[PDB]
Design a protein around this ligand. Sequence first.
Ligand SMILES: CCC(=O)NCc1cc(C)cc(NC(=O)Cc2ncc(Oc3ccnc4cc(OC)ccc34)cc2OC)c1
Length: 294
Amino acid sequence: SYIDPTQLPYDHKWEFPRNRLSFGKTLGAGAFGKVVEATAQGLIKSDAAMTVAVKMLKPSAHSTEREALMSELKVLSYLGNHENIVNLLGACTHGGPTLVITEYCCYGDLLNFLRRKRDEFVPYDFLTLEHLLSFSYQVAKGMAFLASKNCIHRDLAARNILLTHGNITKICDFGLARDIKNDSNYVDKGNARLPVKWMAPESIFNSVYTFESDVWSYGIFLWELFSLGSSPYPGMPVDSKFYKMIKEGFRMSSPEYAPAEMYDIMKTCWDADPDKRPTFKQIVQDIEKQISES
Ligand SMILES: CCC(=O)NCc1cc(C)cc(NC(=O)Cc2ncc(Oc3ccnc4cc(OC)ccc34)cc2OC)c1
């Protein structure tokens, strides 16, 4: 962490009346929080209703989760509106519990979209390599933006990327709105339940989260993307042998649909030395080159 989100301001330009929100289906839910679909009235100038996604806490939440949701709101408010990030539309801080209102992404999380389109994929409404290459570029653009705003995501994965109109991918963070206890992609590591297969060695062994640890996770995201939604390190459990192999330089082979030039990006993201890993800006530039050559 580079910034203290508790020292960030909350612009009351974001404040929305909670009486104007009609709650619908649950998009995602965890132990202490949820993401719910809602209709927001008078959010538009013409007073036309619109579909939004509302993140909020469950009555099960404690003061830690209440602080975490307020810091999340202050970070989302601070970041501003970028095309490859979920865009904050408003919030309800008075009259009750905190409600973080964002745009609704038509097609949900990228992981489930990739698994759904797996059997309807062609390299050259069919999913293609052109789409995958555009998703990899958009995620590095969004991540390059967060790094410039001194934000470390800490949980970069296909599950925390959303797909909307015109094949636009948006970085999100379900966080407390994800059931990490029942998600096999989160392992028990001490007092925590962490996404070990997406984590840099320095994050696992020293709990260090940098710009470079987020780049490692991006390399895992790329493997997921070009494997069409497969789980990393297939058939390998998170045990004593797994940590040993990662420290010994073992890295996954290319996913089945990854261009050789994308696997090169993956290999550099997974360098044991964080200083030898590319920046998200270098990655954007690298993918730009690859896209232009197509
Ligand atoms: C955690 C603490 C912190 O400081 N974090 C920094 C940080 C950084 C960034 C880039 C984003 C965030 N936060 C969010 O992105 C919150 C959030 N995440 C997913 C959400 O899920 C959905 C949003 C929109 N549409 C959907 C559609 C769907 O199925 C159709 C299904 C789900 C959806 C909704 C939602 O807010 C309401 C937070």
